[PDB]
Design an enzyme around this catalytic site. Structure first.
Site: not given
Ligand SMILES: NC(=O)c1ccc[n+]([C@@H]2O[C@H](COP(=O)([O-])OP(=O)(O)OC[C@H]3O[C@@H](n4cnc5c(N)ncnc54)[C@H](OP(=O)(O)O)[C@@H]3O)[C@@H](O)[C@H]2O)c1
Ligand SMILES: C=CCc1ccc(Oc2ccccc2)c(O)c1
Ligand SMILES: NC(=O)c1ccc[n+]([C@@H]2O[C@H](COP(=O)([O-])OP(=O)(O)OC[C@H]3O[C@@H](n4cnc5c(N)ncnc54)[C@H](OP(=O)(O)O)[C@@H]3O)[C@@H](O)[C@H]2O)c1
Ligand SMILES: NC(=O)c1ccc[n+]([C@@H]2O[C@H](COP(=O)([O-])OP(=O)(O)OC[C@H]3O[C@@H](n4cnc5c(N)ncnc54)[C@H](OP(=O)(O)O)[C@@H]3O)[C@@H](O)[C@H]2O)c1
Ligand SMILES: NC(=O)c1ccc[n+]([C@@H]2O[C@H](COP(=O)([O-])OP(=O)(O)OC[C@H]3O[C@@H](n4cnc5c(N)ncnc54)[C@H](OP(=O)(O)O)[C@@H]3O)[C@@H](O)[C@H]2O)c1
Ligand SMILES: C=CCc1ccc(Oc2ccccc2)c(O)c1
Ligand SMILES: C=CCc1ccc(Oc2ccccc2)c(O)c1
Ligand SMILES: C=CCc1ccc(Oc2ccccc2)c(O)c1
Ligand SMILES: N[C@@H](CCC(=O)O)C(=O)O
Ligand SMILES: N[C@@H](CCC(=O)O)C(=O)O
Ligand SMILES: N[C@@H](CCC(=O)O)C(=O)O
Ligand SMILES: N[C@@H](CCC(=O)O)C(=O)O
Lengths: 255, 254, 254, 255
Positions: D93, D156, D163, D192, D194, D196
């Site tokens: 999250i 970012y 983070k 990845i 997504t 987000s």
């Molecule tokens: N994608 C990447 O490249 C990347 C890389 C490194 C780390 N991350 C981390 O990976 C994690 C998952 O993100 P993701 O990339 O998989 O994107 P995602 O599919 O958009 O998932 C983000 C999740 O955060 C939840 N969220 C946001 N606010 C919330 C709240 N107030 N209460 C409960 N849930 C809440 C959203 O739920 P709702 O949609 O129901 O609002 C959603 O399920 C995040 O912590 C992100 O920062 C992402």
């Molecule tokens: C920046 C490259 C990798 C990456 C992408 C998506 C990410 O997830 C979010 C990024 C910004 C706001 C909420 C979640 C995230 O934490 C990291």
């Protein structure tokens, strides 16, 4: 994490207490075929006794003194001829003179400094080079380090600078062998009573401070290092390279 | 202000040397300077570079850090010629050229050990011997690069020599601290030097700094020198075992 | 020498404040100093502590960093009163007492967010407002603690605020770099101050430094201030996004 | 790794591309009971449809907005009553406004800076506190982070500071909960695609730098993150706590 039809080389078993024997038990319990390298004939004798506890149907033992380019080169060459290609190598090898593991770091001799680097760090480089010949499709190389590589720990002295060197070796090997799909990683083990630990001044004190101060409040053991080695050597850790996983009750994370 | 301070500077080879950068800054601050050099080249070179400085005399000592005896006799002589010193600036490293390109996994034992010997072990024996000239305490600074902390393309065997040097600094800080001798490192950004020529793809490295580092410019030897002046002085009295990046903030980004 | 420089120092409460150590040093080096404060009691102490400095003028501004309006209007007043400035020393943090002892897992949302607001966000907004008074660049320094890098018993909610603060320094360095504005932190070792009374087991922490740190002694506020002088001056021109430990080498050991 | 008879809570699935969904698939393959928490009604909808891909014999779905103590407290308490005790929690999250993300970092508003801390960092602390009640004999908590917490990455911005806060939170939680045998750790995922990720400026150029520069010369996926989660959530990683494992093709190791 099922490892049947995988083959790993485990370098650095001396006796039942060796960190590498914890790895061997875990890998062996997960169904891998194992190839062991040793330096001293006494270590071969222990291996032959210890193999009695493992499910390996074949003793694959090779004498490899990592100070010898010849012996690394011909040992791995031979390994390939006997067991074919391999999936990875666990490196559990280090050495320094007693003289250089207590009292004053500033008093380290050149010869004792280069000795610890040669055995404890360079050995990984030439092993990776030779082992890469046996991993045409990719594999996993894991070396064993200590938190003394990242911080000055009392009494660890020349070994700490050699571990710093090893931990960088891992990073440079990771970058260089990445395009070959060879991953390279380190485990940072917490203190464990081994034959080598006997050489470190103050060792009982170190154990105690872990129990008192580390988040889990307990020491780790060799099987715990092995369980993380199983992760690193297996496909469970695809994506992970150049990494250093602390298997140490959390102690790295506290001051 | 460094009047009545005395510092030994190791590893000037020419006008571009990082150590000459340190030299000009410490000299501008009124320090007395001693120089150590490896080959007679860097001597006639130092003879001429020393005319720029305000040193009223030429304290030059040949030391190949590959020899215990040279490091020992050298520092003993410095002690007889100038007395107690206030700090050492270490600016010394080496690797064979074929080790600074292509595949790190192909590094020879001999070349790996040579880089360790010159680029990391040297600091330990220098400090042991320099200690003898600092009964009241003092300050030792070595020069590293970000390559000792991260794998950088081409830097190879020197990256492992630097990682080694950086821990060397930490272990010397812990050992020597009770004697009031502080030991630190400056992680310099890329600067065009004689040795800088031997690293594969050094120009791509300089350009990345301008494009990507926070200050969007490269650093020079004088900036290293300014930070050496801090570490070598009482301005940094509370600071030991530290690594300060003089690299336009490159270290802090990805 | 800092004559014709002007710095804003934020967070003196009394003679023991780390920021008063910074003020002494910078004052001694010939800087013009502007001070900001939160509580009435702190302005009183400031008025009294000025008599020990060589400031010809008392430049004092109430700025509670929880309020944007106060920061925006404080810095605007400062620019009208003294003109362009050369940097800012930030020495501000806060957490509720029960959040500096016991169990971290029991921290309240309002307490966690309060510590972030005052101890980390406040740098971001101060930087934005201070940038306006640094058309040609300058230098910003925040005060942090090793507990931002490791989990330290009892430091709890403040550890997480310092980790946020240390990243805030890096992101600001990258943002403000092209404007020739450097941003750095000093990680100070433990020092008896009014705030330190909020941290469970403080005395034990102090005793551990004396016993285990390389220098085997605790640091003081003037040692912090000497490193601040370096970071806030042109000595450190090449250095940004960095965290310098003024902690007797404690960070380097385990 | 085998996870029959284990139960995990997975927080932060929004759709098929969510990192947490890669976690779910891996754990579900390994035999775990999974319990799922969501914020938006649209996320419960995707969950219901994604559950068909999975071996879970039972939908266990709970709305929990981690902005609300009550929802976290009541949510975990109801989970306890429905499934019994749990063995760990995967936290996936984070949130930040677009309007702060595409500013110069120095322009970040107070409310957006604190919003990002509240959701992306504090939520772990409160989750840990409530989840602890369901882990009398110990268990494991994993959160998802990014390299931009350790280094300033272009664009970012406010999420990098969050983070950094999350990565310290992990450490402090590891220390606090260690004596209860609860391990807390982070996975630092590589970029990845997504939902987000669609709010991070220049995401595509980030993706491509990985391929060009990361030792493995390729990007990672959700499933690679899940395999490392399975490791962290299971007994394989006993002795590991307050660790941050980079699943990023080795990118964290290079400059
Ligand atoms: N994608 C990447 O490249 C990347 C890389 C490194 C780390 N991350 C981390 O990976 C994690 C998952 O993100 P993701 O990339 O998989 O994107 P995602 O599919 O958009 O998932 C983000 C999740 O955060 C939840 N969220 C946001 N606010 C919330 C709240 N107030 N209460 C409960 N849930 C809440 C959203 O739920 P709702 O949609 O129901 O609002 C959603 O399920 C995040 O912590 C992100 O920062 C992402
Ligand atoms: C920046 C490259 C990798 C990456 C992408 C998506 C990410 O997830 C979010 C990024 C910004 C706001 C909420 C979640 C995230 O934490 C990291
Ligand atoms: N015990 C701990 O607290 C701990 C903690 C962190 C890291 N480590 C690391 O764990 C690794 C294994 O050590 P250990 O604690 O398990 O002690 P150990 O049982 O004594 O093992 C050390 C091994 O090093 C081998 N070795 C030394 N020089 C060699 C050479 N020239 N060529 C081939 N092998 C050589 C030894 O073989 P011979 O006996 O046959 O000569 C021995 O099997 C080492 O890297 C050590 O630094 C240990
Ligand atoms: N240039 C950069 O971008 C950069 C960046 C970070 C760190 N550094 C570090 O800065 C230091 C100096 O490098 P530089 O760039 O200034 O190059 P440089 O001018 O070529 O200096 C290298 C020096 O090392 C000396 N040296 C090599 N082997 C020696 C030995 N065995 N005994 C005594 N001296 C020896 C050389 O002496 P002789 O020529 O007399 O043999 C020369 O004076 C090195 O530690 C280097 O790793 C440089
Ligand atoms: N002492 C140590 O061992 C130590 C070690 C490392 C780092 N630090 C850091 O050093 C800095 C200050 O340190 P200190 O130990 O010197 O304590 P101090 O003397 O108690 O100063 C703390 C200052 O923070 C100010 N402050 C709190 N909330 C504020 C707000 N909302 N708006 C404006 N100012 C506010 C206080 O001002 P008022 O009194 O007017 O409210 C006080 O001047 C902090 O960042 C602290 O975390 C301290
Ligand atoms: C000192 C605390 C932990 C520890 C114990 C034993 C270790 O193994 C060696 C220590 C010194 C020389 C050779 C091996 C080792 O590398 C680390
Ligand atoms: C890669 C660019 C930065 C750089 C340039 C020159 C350096 O000095 C040496 C580089 C290789 C061998 C000996 C010294 C050095 O250590 C680092
Ligand atoms: C824990 C020992 C070092 C230490 C002492 C005092 C500190 O200052 C504050 C501690 C808690 C709330 C506000 C400020 C501080 O941040 C760090
Ligand atoms: N201090 C004793 C005991 C050390 C230990 O526990 O190994 C020694 O130097 O051998
Ligand atoms: N153990 C002492 C420490 C207080 C302090 O030294 O700040 C207490 O909790 O009061
Ligand atoms: N305050 C210093 C800042 C140093 C710098 O920006 O390089 C100055 O006078 O500019
Ligand atoms: N840089 C483009 C693409 C952003 C993205 O891929 O998330 C933008 O400003 O939106």
């Amino acid at each position: 994490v099922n490892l049947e039809n995988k083959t790993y080389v485990i370098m650095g078993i001396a006796n039942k207490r060796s960190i590498a024997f914890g790895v061997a038990k875990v890998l062996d319990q997960l169904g891998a075929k194992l190839v062991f390298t040793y330096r001293k004939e006494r270590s071969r004798k222990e291996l032959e006794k210890l193999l009695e506890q493992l499910n390996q149907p074949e003793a694959h033992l090779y004498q490899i003194d990592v100070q010898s380019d010849e012996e690394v080169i011909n040992g791995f060459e031979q390994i390939g001829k006997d067991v074919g290609n391999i999936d990875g190598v666990y490196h559990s090898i280090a050495f320094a003179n007693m003289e250089d593991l207590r009292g004053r770091f500033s008093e380290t001799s050149r010869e004792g400094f280069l000795l610890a680097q040669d055995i404890s760090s360079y050995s990984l480089t030439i092993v990776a080079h030779e082992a890469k010949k046996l991993m045409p499709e990719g594999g996993s190389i894991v070396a064993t380090t200590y938190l003394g590589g990242e911080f000055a720990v009392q009494n660890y002295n020349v070994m700490g600078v050699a571990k710093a060197s090893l931990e960088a070796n891992v990073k440079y090997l990771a970058l260089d062998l990445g395009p070959d799909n060879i991953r390279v990683n380190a485990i940072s083990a917490g203190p464990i009573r081994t034959l080598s630990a006997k050489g470190v001044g103050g060792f009982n004190t170190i154990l105690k401070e872990i129990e008192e101060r580390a988040p889990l409040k307990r020491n780790v053991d060799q099987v715990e290092v092995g369980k993380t080695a199983a992760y690193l050597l297996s496909d469970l850790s695809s994506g992970v390279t150049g990494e250093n996983i602390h298997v140490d009750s959390g102690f790295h994370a506290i001051k």
